[PDB]
Ligand binder design. Structure first.
Ligand code: A1AWR
Ligand code: GDP
Ligand code: MG
Length: 170
């Protein structure tokens, strides 16, 4: 059989949401992707032996708190909270995205995964230990990724699918 998953990639401008989603979907790195383009991208993959249709929302629109916007974001079954390891502000911004997800879901148990992207760059400003401690504080997994080299990309999205699955079995 198969299961579909609405996954949502969030995080500050430029952390690599689009590059991560395109790597997952098409298996290459897109270095210039219009920062304004918001769209969903589909991938079929087997995860732990079950066909999984991933419907991935790559967010990009202006910060907006309308009923329509809240209701759309609520459709996400799981969220990737993406920051870039050479951008400490994107790391601090993670709490804002977690908070907003919690708000529209009116739940403290939303499937989420913390993703530290750009792990191929030497210019790291976010300690891996710090990022691990943050995810532990949320009770969610942490995965270091590079959309450029594809390191950890499968692990990040598949972990999120697994978190949704567990939240179901619960
Ligand atoms: C380069 C353009 C780009 O990638 N984006 C990404 C989306 N986005 C954005 N930004 C913010 O906040 C920007 C900063 C941090 C806090 C102060 N502010 C100035 N917040 C966003 C969101 F909260 C959401 C969002 N919106 C609603 N209504 C509900 C939910 C659950 C969310 C969430 F993302 F958390 F899922 C969105 Cl969709 C996008 C946000 C810009 C940086 C533009
Ligand atoms: N070195 C490196 N650059 C990346 C990586 N992911 C994204 N980028 C670059 O970072 C910038 C923003 O990426 P983009 O996907 O547009 O970010 P978004 O605004 O979160 O969608 C672009 O210059 C990308 O080429 C990565 O893993 N490594
Ligand atoms: Mg983008």
């Amino acid at each position: 059989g198969m299961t579909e998953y609405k996954l949502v990639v969030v995080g500050a401008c430029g952390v690599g949401k689009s590059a991560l989603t395109i790597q997952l979907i098409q298996n290459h790195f897109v270095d210039e992707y219009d920062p304004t383009i918001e769209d969903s991208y589909r991938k079929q993959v087997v995860i732990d032996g079950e066909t999984s249709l991933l419907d991935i929302l790559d967010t990009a629109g202006q910060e907006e708190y309308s009923a329509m916007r809240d209701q759309y974001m609520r459709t996400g079954e799981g969220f990737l909270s993406v920051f870039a390891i050479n951008n400490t502000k994107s790391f601090e911004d993670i709490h804002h995205y977690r908070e907003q997800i919690k708000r529209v879901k009116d739940s403290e148990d939303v499937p989420m995964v913390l993703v530290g992207n750009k792990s191929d760059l030497p210019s790291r400003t976010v300690d891996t230990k710090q990022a691990q401690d943050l995810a532990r504080s949320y009770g969610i997994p942490f995965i270091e990724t590079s959309a450029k080299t594809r390191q950890g990309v499968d692990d990040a999205f598949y972990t999120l699918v697994r978190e949704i699955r567990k939240h179901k079995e619960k």
